[PDB]
Design a protein around this nucleic acid. Structure first.
Lengths: 126, 215, 84, 99, 59, 64, 136, 150
RNA sequence: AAGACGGACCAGAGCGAAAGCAUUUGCCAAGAAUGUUUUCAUUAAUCAAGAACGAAAGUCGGAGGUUCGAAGACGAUCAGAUACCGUCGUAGUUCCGACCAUAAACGAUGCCGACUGGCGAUGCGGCGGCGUUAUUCCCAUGACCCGCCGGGCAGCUUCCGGGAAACCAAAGUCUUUGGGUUCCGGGGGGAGUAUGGUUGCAAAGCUGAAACUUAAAGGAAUUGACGGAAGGGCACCACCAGG
């Protein structure tokens, strides 16, 4: 219920993750001594809360990027997987069933395709 | 101050629906012993039995409370005659709903039997096949016209088809669908339901017919 | 509209949808039609919004069914105003 | 000023209307200026149905419904919280909460 | 289903040409009403009602 | 009118209610007939399961 | 006058005519016509309290004693006729309607049928109360 | 502006810009007036004559066929309604309310409308008294209301 | 039996000048909308006077009184209740034929005409549709959908514009001040009292002051605070269980 983590732990631990994601681990006494090594924390107990929340973060972030913190190794890899080719934007929807007014737009664009029909049971859309 | 033991003085009378009901013996009533010191024949043969069809037919429905005057009690058997069928409150106020035209028809119509009956009806509208209106109404002209056909067929079928045949029409509403069907060229009418049957006149001359009702 | 237009010659649908006295040029579209029904042996001039029966002598009692809107026809006919 | 625009409920297209009492206070309020309420409710409510439906023998008939149209005066709608104090920006809302 | 076969109990008692007109349209309804497998009681029920279909010179 | 004592075990605490939040709402399933599940209240603090000696299922102890 | 042929083994029906109201809950079963009631027992017959006569617990005392004497007198099943005040009135039943029907179910009187018996006018005759009434 | 009537809608037609109507079959003056003079022998109002001139015949109005309108033709004939035909139906409207008021002493609608209808008469008929259409010494009256309609 | 009343259905809907109008059905004339190469040829507009109508209670005279119910009184309520409350109940309600002419008759919002923005409904009429449904052997019906036209009820929506803001396509097109016609206010009172007129059977209604009194009265809106206003959380200086 109590001693929930305020702004000071989470803002400090975030900078620690994105720079030290190799040298951080998931053992506290590693990361407590790592936050001795890599950080200047004015209390051991504050270092207990920070490096413990680092172990909270490192457990989360080794499950990929979690909300509120991310690493560019994970972030750019999303963009590297975002070379995704779904189409060539030519299916071919060359002649297939389209709207008759799209057909009339295709008539104004001189290709044409199969046209929808039958105003029946109106509202068309109901 | 004063109590008695009147349950040393009641007699059981087998309440009989007519034989156009597949359950004739509806139930039994401990009627107080009809005698000289205690006359109870008027609370025996003047008994109107207000029973739903479930114990009357054997079960199409369990609403539709028939009133049943006992035209003759024949040897501990209340051989009842029809008085008035209903469409009782839970069934009755289910169809009553906002944003529809509630259509009604009260008629007072003599049977082919000696019985004057009242028949009050109810009717309602539908949201039709393609209707995007939330409600379901029309002009009041159509509202008046549907009521005119609804009174007409109801007076017609009860003037014909003597009292027990009125009973033998109206459980799936033999008057009901034709009011919908004749108006279906105008409005197909999702409801016609005759609800208040009130016997206005009740002569006892159909005791042979009471034996034709029963047995 | 972008509130900057000028239609000295607008499209003939936005006036033609209006009421006959609500037009840019108030001239009705109600008109005469010439009835090809075989109930008459002749072709009889009937106004669109005729409001009344129009009959003939080549027919006895039907040439058109009356209508306060555009008049009701029997078996299909031709129609011509002509030149309003 | 107009603390309410519709003043409970509008009376537009109607010069004058019929009044109504409160269903729980008998206080005179107009029909289209009061709080109406339909009630579709079982006659066999869930306190009894755990014992009625077991003793309901020869009863393959469904549970019946009671149909009650309630009408409150505004004074006994608010203190009973049939309606209640909303913000004036919420006072624009003609929306009944769902059942 | 204790009522659907028992519909045609009183549908058949109340007869006069309105009911055999209606009772065809009941069995049109009764078929995919309670959209279940024809186990046994539907060969009991529907072979009374489809029997009532074919008897009345239906659609 | 009169009925014998029913031993209905707690299935689930349904809350701690009342004016002070101290009247413990409890689903006491009947423990003898597994379809019957009655809901009563407890004055005292209960952790679940414990067989509550209902002298009645009448006078139905419900939310307060 | 015991039961008709037997007091158990058949469902000879009585009709409830339970006038559940405010400040009393009458459980008052008649013959099938209605003219001949049995068991004149009010909800305040059991507990004459004059504020608890429509209360649920007193109606459980009231309905089961009716339910006792019904199955005593060969009526083994009940058509539920649960009535409100009815008429051009409050037309609302009291709190002794849910528990008492549950009580007679627990007492042992069978229920075959359930149906609503509350009368409502067409906005008939005038109501008690002036213009103000109890002002809140 | 309608203080004579509570309406806000439309009772009047549109007329085309051309005076040559319908210019496919313009049945002559003799075609329309011998019809008119028979209808003046039959005694219809020009409101009724001009309808049956419109729909039955190949022409619409006589203001396109002739220069005169029907009442102008009827005035040039001299056989004309001696009160204005629209005013005649105005006086017809008042008698129908008055007789209905003579039937119902409780129809408060008929009490109010008979004011406004006759007020619509007294503002209309006064104008025809001025321009030698009605005789100005004549004045509208409930006695003379049923006299003119009958 | 009595007399009352048609609930629910019943709405930002209809009609009606408002005051208004909820069973069916009939009669009666009316009125709106719409459509209208019909007709009149401008007859139009708005409105002192004048007139109609105008809730209610009251009153006039009855019926009527089922129901209720000013008064009225208790039973209870409170320091006090006559009140709320419970009970009973008069007039009244019921209704007729009268007066009354008033209402917060309120939309706290002149009329008519013009002009200035977006949408989606709904009552209405007319129209557009290889629209659906629907009947007779199908059309023509109608239910309904899309669309349109209006005149509606209005709604929503935007630097349309304004406004003290509130809000308002009107409460816009006003200092860049003028459509027309009628009505009304000049800080707050005294006071619709006096005074006279005036009607009404009366009840009362209407026209309509002064002495004196005052630098504020008022309006929106912000911010608090308060609530026998409402919705949230927490503390044994608060409870619980307790000691």
């Amino acid at each position: 219920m109590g001693r929930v983590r305020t702004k000071t732990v989470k803002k400090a631990a975030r900078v620690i993750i994105e720079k030290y994601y190799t040298r951080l681990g998931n053992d506290f006494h590693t990361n407590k001594r790592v936050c001795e090594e890599i950080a200047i924390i004015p209390s051991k107990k504050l270092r207990n809360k920070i490096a413990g929340y680092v172990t909270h973060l490192m457990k989360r972030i080794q499950r990929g990027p979690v909300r509120g913190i991310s690493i560019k190794l994970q972030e750019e890899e999303r963009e590297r997987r975002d070379n995704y080719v779904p189409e060539v934007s030519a299916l071919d929807q060359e002649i297939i069933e389209v709207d008759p007014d799209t057909k009339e737009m295709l008539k104004l664009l001189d290709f044409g395709s199969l046209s929808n029909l039958q105003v029946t049971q109106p509202t068309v859309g109901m | 101050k004063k109590v008695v033991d009147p349950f040393s003085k009641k007699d059981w009378y087998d309440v009989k629906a007519p034989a156009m009901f597949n359950i004739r013996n509806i139930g039994k009533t401990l009627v107080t012993r009809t005698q000289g010191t205690k006359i109870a024949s008027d609370g025996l043969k003047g008994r109107v039995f207000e029973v739903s069809l479930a114990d009357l037919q054997n079960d199409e429905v369990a609403f539709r409370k028939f009133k049943l005057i006992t035209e003759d009690v024949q040897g501990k058997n209340c051989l009842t005659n029809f008085h008035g069928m209903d469409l009782t409150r839970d069934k009755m106020c289910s169809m009553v709903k906002k944003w529809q035209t509630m259509i009604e028809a009260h008629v007072d119509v003599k049977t082919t039997d000696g019985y004057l009956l009242h028949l009050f009806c109810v009717g309602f509208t539908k949201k039709c096949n393609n209707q995007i209106r939330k409600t379901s109404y029309a002009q009041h002209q159509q509202v008046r016209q549907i009521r005119k056909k609804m009174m007409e067929i109801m007076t017609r079928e009860v003037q014909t088809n003597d009292l027990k045949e009125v009973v033998n029409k109206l459980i799936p509403d033999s008057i009901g669908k034709d009011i919908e069907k004749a108006c279906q060229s105008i409005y197909p009418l999702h409801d016609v339901f005759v609800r208040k049957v009130k016997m206005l006149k009740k002569p006892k001359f159909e005791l042979g017919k009471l034996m034709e009702l029963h047995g | 509209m972008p509130l900057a237009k000028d239609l000295l010659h607008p499209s003939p649908e936005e006036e033609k949808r209006k009421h006959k006295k609500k037009r840019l040029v108030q001239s009705p579209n109600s008109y005469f039609m010439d009835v090809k029904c075989p109930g008459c042996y002749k072709i009889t001039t009937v106004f669109s919004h005729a409001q009344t029966v129009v009959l003939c002598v080549g027919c006895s009692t039907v040439l058109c069914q009356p209508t306060g809107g555009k008049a009701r026809l029997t078996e299909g006919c031709s129609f011509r105003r002509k030149q309003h | 000023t107009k603390k309410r625009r519709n003043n409970g409920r509008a009376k537009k297209g109607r010069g004058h209307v019929q009044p109504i009492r409160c269903t729980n206070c008998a206080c005179c309020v107009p029909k289209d200026k009061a709080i109406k309420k339909f009630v579709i409710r079982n006659i066999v409510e869930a306190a009894a149905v755990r014992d009625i439906s077991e003793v309901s023998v020869f009863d393959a008939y469904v549970l019946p419904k009671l149909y009650v149209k309630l009408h409150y005066c505004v004074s006994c709608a608010i203190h009973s919280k049939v309606v209640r104090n909303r913000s004036r920006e919420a006072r624009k809302d003609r929306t009944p909460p769902p059942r | 289903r204790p009522e659907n076969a028992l519909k045609r109990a009183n549908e058949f008692l109340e007869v006069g040409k309105k009911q055999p007109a209606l009772d065809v349209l009941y069995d049109v309804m009764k078929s995919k009403k309670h959209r279940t497998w024809q186990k046994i009681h539907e060969p009991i029920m529907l072979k009374y009602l489809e029997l009532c279909v074919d008897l009345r010179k239906s659609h | 009118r009169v009925q014998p004592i029913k031993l209905a075990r707690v299935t689930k605490v349904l809350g701690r209610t009342g004016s002070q939040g101290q009247c413990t709402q409890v689903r006491v399933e009947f423990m003898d007939d597994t379809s019957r599940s009655i809901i009563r209240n407890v004055k005292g603090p209960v952790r679940e399961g414990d067989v509550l000696t209902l002298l009645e299922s009448e006078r139905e102890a419900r939310r307060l | 006058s015991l039961g008709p042929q037997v007091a158990e083994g058949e469902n000879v029906f009585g009709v409830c005519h339970i006038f559940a109201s405010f400040n009393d809950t009458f459980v008052h079963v008649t013959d099938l016509s209605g003219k001949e009631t049995i068991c004149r027992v009010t909800g305040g017959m059991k507990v004459k309290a004059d504020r608890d006569e429509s209360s649920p617990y007193a109606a459980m005392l009231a309905a089961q004693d009716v339910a006792q004497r019904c199955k005593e007198l060969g009526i083994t099943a009940l058509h539920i006729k649960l009535r409100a005040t009815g008429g051009n009135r409050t037309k609302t039943p009291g709190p002794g309607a849910q528990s008492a029907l549950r009580a007679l179910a627990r007492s042992g009187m069978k229920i075959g049928r359930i149906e609503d018996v509350t009368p409502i006018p067409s906005d008939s005759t005038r109501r008690k109360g002036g213009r103000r009434g109890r002002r809140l | 502006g309608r203080m004579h009537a509570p309406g806000k809608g439309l009772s009047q037609s549109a007329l085309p810009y051309r005076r040559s109507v319908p210019t496919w079959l313009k049945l002559t003056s003799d075609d329309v007036k011998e019809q008119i003079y028979k209808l003046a022998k039959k005694g219809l109002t020009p409101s009724q004559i001009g309808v049956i001139l419109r729909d039955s015949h190949g022409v619409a109005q006589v203001r396109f066929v002739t220069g005169n309108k029907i009442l102008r033709i009827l005035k040039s004939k001299g056989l004309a309604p001696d009160l204005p035909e629209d005013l005649y139906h105005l006086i017809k409207k008042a008698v129908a309310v008055r007789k209905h008021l003579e039937r119902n002493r409780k129809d408060k609608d008929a009490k109010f409308r008979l004011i406004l209808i006759e007020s619509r008469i007294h503002r209309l008929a006064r104008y025809y008294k001025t321009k030698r259409v009605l005789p100005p010494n004549w004045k509208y009256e409930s006695s003379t209301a049923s006299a003119l309609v009958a």
